[PDB]
Every structure is written in C-alpha cells, then in structure tokens.
Amino acid sequence: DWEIPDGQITVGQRIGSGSFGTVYKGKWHGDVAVKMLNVTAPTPQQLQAFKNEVGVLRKTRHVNILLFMGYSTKPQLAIVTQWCEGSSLYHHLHASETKFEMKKLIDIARQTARGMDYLHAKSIIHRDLKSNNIFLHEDNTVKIGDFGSILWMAPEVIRMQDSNPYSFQSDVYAFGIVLYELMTGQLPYSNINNRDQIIEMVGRGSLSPDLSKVRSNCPKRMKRLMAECLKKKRDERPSFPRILAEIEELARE
Numbered sequence: 001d002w003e004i005p006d007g008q009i010t011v012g013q014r015i016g017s018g019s020f021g022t023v024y025k026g027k028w029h030g031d032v033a034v035k036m037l038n039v040t041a042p043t044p045q046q047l048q049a050f051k052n053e054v055g056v057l058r059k060t061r062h063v064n065i066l067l068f069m070g071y072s073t074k075p076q077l078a079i080v081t082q083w084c085e086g087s088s089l090y091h092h093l094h095a096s097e098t099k100f101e102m103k104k105l106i107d108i109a110r111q112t113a114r115g116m117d118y119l120h121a122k123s124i125i126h127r128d129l130k131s132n133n134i135f136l137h138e139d140n141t142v143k144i145g146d147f148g149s150i151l152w153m154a155p156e157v158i159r160m161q162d163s164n165p166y167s168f169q170s171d172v173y174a175f176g177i178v179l180y181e182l183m184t185g186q187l188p189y190s191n192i193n194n195r196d197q198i199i200e201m202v203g204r205g206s207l208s209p210d211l212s213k214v215r216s217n218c219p220k221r222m223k224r225l226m227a228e229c230l231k232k233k234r235d236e237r238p239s240f241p242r243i244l245a246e247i248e249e250l251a252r253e
C-alpha cells in the first residue's frame, strides 16, 4: 500500500499556496514534496478530488512523469512526490532569458514526447499540458505533472463543444504549442493583447499561432510536425507514437 502513516513526514518549507491547496517541501527518507489540502474536514466532492488524483498517479512509473511516492490521510489530505529542483520550462523560456541550444530544445521536446506517450498508453488524458506544467528537474530531466492557460487550448476546447472536449488530440494540440515555445522562443499570440480576443478568434478559427517566428536552425521536420499538431480539426492531429518516432528520429543527429 502507498499510504503514509501520520508523523512520518516532517512538513518543511511552504513553496506555493493556492486557494485549493498548498505545496510544501518536506522530508521523508530524503527530500520530498507534499501537496496538502487547506481543509480540516473535506467534502466528498473534494475527498475524491484527492482519491482520483491518487489513482492516476499510482498508475505512473516513468522517468518523465513526476514520481508519486505515497499519500497521507491525516491530519489533512496530502499527496507526496519526489522533490524536483530547478525551474519549469516556462520560467526558462519566458521569465528567464535561458540561452537554450537547439540540441537541448529537441531533447526537451523528446522527453516531453516520451512522457506524454506513456500517459496515453495508460489511457491518461492530461487536460493541462503547458510549459509551466513541465518541470526541468536539475535543468535536464523533464518531469511532467500538475504544478498549479488558454494559449494551449485547442479550438474545440475553447468552444467547450458538448461536455468534455478534452481528448488525446487536445493533449496533442497542447504539445504542439510546447513545440512552438521551444522552436520560436516566445508564446503564441504574442501580438494579440487581450485574453477575450484570443478566446473569440480561436473559437471561430480566425486566429492561429504564427509559424514564421521559429528559429532559423529549426529543423524542417520539427517545423512540420508542429503544424501537424496544430491542425484545427482534432482528427487530423498525429498520435504520440507517431510523434515520439519522428522526434527521436531527428534527435539522432
């Protein structure tokens, strides 16, 4: 079982605080990272907001997913993961002037590919793939997870067609936008300066990322796979085994 008895985890420094919960850096047989719920007695609605997150976590065992280690029940509900060190891909590309090199941009794209590939085989749809949900552990090892947003939302997701628009292809579209960030350097819709403008225009297909902003030494394979991931219709996008294959094939240069 993965339940961690009360008192085993010395909850150390607070890292991030949200209205929902709070992420502390902790100590348990080494450095860990605990995500707690700021409620004494949780409602059944949020009870299994915790029970569900756990399930999808204990199903993962990949180098490029955040390592689940266990969960606490008392005194408050808590998820326990490995303790990563460094910044997210977002901090690196947009908040810091990280002088990233082409080989390493491809490698980050490749690790993310492998990571997202593994989720899909386990039939796990992320629903929020983005640059700041991708942690660069030791500024090398990519760890995918939920570390907390419309810029990565596919047109059909922006429209909220029916109930859930979230699918494997929604993650594919998001992945493209990550490739866009790696290959251009900036975020998409850099010139549009209104959130409500991005939602409306993408919703009618009148707006899409500017693909003429990528680096010069952006490999043509990657330029085209990027386009393929951003096809406006969900069923035109490539699946991750296709993607992993393509990226890994060009990475061997």
Ligand SMILES: O=C1CCc2c(Oc3ccc4c(c3)[C@@H]3[C@H](O4)[C@H]3c3nc4cc(C(F)(F)F)ccc4[nH]3)ccnc2N1
Residues within 6 Å of the ligand: 015, 023, 033, 034, 035, 053, 056, 057, 060, 065, 066, 079, 080, 081, 082, 083, 084, 085, 086, 119, 124, 126, 144, 145, 146, 147
């Ligand atoms: O500097 C920092 C602060 C944030 C942080 C960490 O924050 C977290 C601590 C605990 C924690 C999380 C994030 C979220 C929850 O519990 C982790 C999580 N991983 C997930 C992976 C998935 C998926 F991969 F899609 F299956 C889904 C939900 C997930 N939730 C953990 C490790 N290193 C760092 N680095």
